[PDB]
Every structure is written in C-alpha cells, then in structure tokens.
C-alpha cells in the first residue's frame, strides 16, 4: 500500500508541439488506445491536444508556463496500480476524442471545453490508492479537511490542481481576467466533483431526464450536467477499449483494491467483499460495474450525442465477453502473479 511522490522540460521546449498524425495517425480516433503512448511522450501529447483543439492560441497560453503546468501535473500522481498518471493522461485524451468526433462545440461554450480537459489532467491529483470510505476510518488529514462536506479525495485533487496553478511559472490562466480566473476555479471545481461516484449516483434521475427530454444549449443546468456526463464517461473511458484494455484494467483496479483490503484488515476492520482478495471474484464484480455503472453512463453519452454509439456497443461487447470468460476464472481474488493474461 506504499506508493511514493517522484516530488515535492527543455525536450519539452526546444522541440515544438508536434502535430497529433506524427504522434498516431490512429491519434484522433474512438480506436487508439492511450495506454500505448510511452509514459516520456505523454506530456508532448498533452501540449499537441491542447494545440490542436486551438486553445494554446485562443487563450494565449505562455507555452513554457504550459509546459511546466503539465509537468507539475504529471509529477502530482503517485504510483498506485490505477490511480497513477498514465489514467490521468488515458482521461484527457478520452477528453480529446469527444471534442474531435462528437459535436462538442454544438454543446459547450469553449471555456467550458477548456475546463474539462484541465480538469481531466487534474481530475484524480495526489491520490492514494484507497477510496473516500478508507479516508474516513484511517482517520487522514484530508478526511478531517473535508469528510464533513462530502467527497473527500475528490476535494483534495481539486485543491491541489488550485496548488499547483499557485506555483510560480505554472500558471497557464494567470492572465486571464478576475471573472474569467474564477469562471475557470468554479468549472474544476464541478467537474472534478462530478468524479465521485456517489455524486453521479445522486444526479442520475436527472441525466436519465436531460436525454429524455433533450439537450438545449440555453439552460445553463444542461451545461452543468452534461459536464458531470462527460466527465464520467471520460474517467471510464477504459471500457470502451479493446477486450485486453478491460482485461488489463481490471488486473490494475483490483490489484490497487486489494492492497486497500489488505490494509483495512491489518487495521483490525473488515473491508468491503469487492477489496477483499479472499472474497472478491472479478467478472461477478466487473460485470456489475458495467451494467449498473458503466454501460448507463454511455447509453446517455448515445441519447445525447448519436455518433457516441459506438462507445455503448463495445462497452455492451466487453461486458459480453466477460460473462463467456467467467467460466475459465474459477478463483476469488487475483492468481499469484496478479495478473489476468491467462483470459
Ligand atoms: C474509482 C472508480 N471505480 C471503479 N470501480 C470498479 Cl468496481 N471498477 C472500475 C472503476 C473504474 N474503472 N473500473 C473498471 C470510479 C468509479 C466510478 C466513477 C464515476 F462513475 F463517477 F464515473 C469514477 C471512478
Ligand atoms: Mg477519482
Ligand atoms: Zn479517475
């Protein structure tokens, strides 16, 4: 359960942003897989998504502040199984993808864009490997900061995406204007929120309205709540990859939830059965996540956006292909060598 901070850029600058074809000719498609991408080539990719959907120009950003700002970004993640940089970096370009295929500029005023791709890069900031409810019993500094309010890490990665915007050099929204610095703080702010699933959990009813009813660009609460959808299915955006992506991730998730498990019961408590290893069986689990989780996430994504369904089918087929592989995972928890390559 130890996972360390590297912490307490000429590569970057010298060699200019590069267009997103020299990255992948695939970059720009529901099809590329983020993951691929090495962890060095990350922080150009960052820079080439934010050149490329223009907001480097339309907001004058300084590209060396916005080059140091992603690289205190990057360093901001610990190294837990999941909750590391490379989701971060697999959230924000899921971020891009939508901007690129659906007809985001259709939905959104840009600023709004803007707010959710920083907030992606921002979203899970510091994170520990352990869950809100964890916060909680250990009895952590963020829980007495802020369990009483709700959302405990989801406030502290919003806090230090605020620290590091107030470190000297990294301020990429430093010239804007007193209204538009704080239009930005109050987006990611409601964005990153929009993370805990619990809050997703209370908003449902509503989204599950929204589409029904359908989306007007001039209800200012279809902006808000198309943002906390967006963001969602951007944090799950694993799923919607190819059926070794899941696999993988699942190997990833449950390893961190584990170790969480594992910690919880050298406390003297008793985890939850899905962070027990001696409990736990994964496509049980997995396959509960997708269709109570998951797969209504990406249903609304579809109501709403009719080029997103594509996203649902194959979030729907790997949902499929977990069920026909349970058969051969005949064990609670993880094989030995924590990995699920024998599916
Ligand atoms: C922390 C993460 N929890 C998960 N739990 C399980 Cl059982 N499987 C998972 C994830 C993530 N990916 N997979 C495959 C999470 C859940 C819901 C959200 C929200 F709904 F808000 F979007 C954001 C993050
Ligand atoms: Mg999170
Ligand atoms: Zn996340």
């Known amino acids: 359960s130890l996972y360390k901070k590297a912490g307490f850029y000429t590569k970057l600058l010298h060699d200019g942003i590069q267009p997103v074809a020299a990255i992948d000719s695939n970059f720009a498609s529901f099809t590329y897989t983020p993951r691929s991408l090495p962890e060095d080539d990350t922080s150009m990719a960052i820079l080439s998504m934010l050149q490329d959907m223009n907001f480097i120009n339309n907001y004058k950003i300084d590209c060396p502040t916005l080059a140091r700002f992603c690289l205190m970004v990057k360093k901001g993640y610990r190294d837990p199984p ?102 930005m703080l109050d987006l990611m702010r409601d964005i990153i929120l929009a993370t805990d699933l619990a809050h997703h959990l209370r908003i449902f009813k509503d989204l599950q309205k929204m589409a029904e009813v359908g989306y007007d660009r ?73 269709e109570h989780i998951a797969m209504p996430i990406y249903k609304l994504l579809q109501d709403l956006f009719p080029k997103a369904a594509e996203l649902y089918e194959r979030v729907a087929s790997n949902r499929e292909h977990w069920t026909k592989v349970s058969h051969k995972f005949t064990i609670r928890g993880l094989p030995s060598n924590n990995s699920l390559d024998f599916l």
């Not at 909750?83 to 939905?107: D, G, I, P, Q, R």
């Not at 959104?108 to 920083?118: K, M, N, P, R, T």
């Not at 951007?234 to 699942?250: F, N, P, V």
Request: aromatic share 12%; charged share 20%.
């Open 82 to 183: 999941y909750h590391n940089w490379m989701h971060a970096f697999s959230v924000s370009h899921f971020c891009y993808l939508l901007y690129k295929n659906l007809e985001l500029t259709n939905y959104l005023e840009d600023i709004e864009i803007f707010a959710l791709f920083i907030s992606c890069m921002c979203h899970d900031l510091d994170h520990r490997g352990t869950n809100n409810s964890f916060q909680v019993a250990s009895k952590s500094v963020l829980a007495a900061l802020y369990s009483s309010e709700g959302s405990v890490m989801e406030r502290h990665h919003f806090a230090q995406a605020i620290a590091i915007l107030n470190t000297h050099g990294c301020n990429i929204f430093d010239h804007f204007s007193r209204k538009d610095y704080q239009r």
């Open 218 to 290: 001039n209800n200012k609460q279809h902006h808000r709540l198309l943002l906390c959808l967006l963001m969602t299915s951007c944090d799950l955006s694993d799923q919607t990859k190819g059926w070794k992506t899941t696999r993988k991730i699942a190997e990833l998730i449950y390893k961190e939830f584990f170790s969480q498990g594992d910690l919880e019961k050298a406390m003297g408590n008793r985890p939850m059965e899905m962070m027990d290893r001696e409990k736990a069986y994964i496509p049980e689990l997995q396959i509960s996540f997708m």
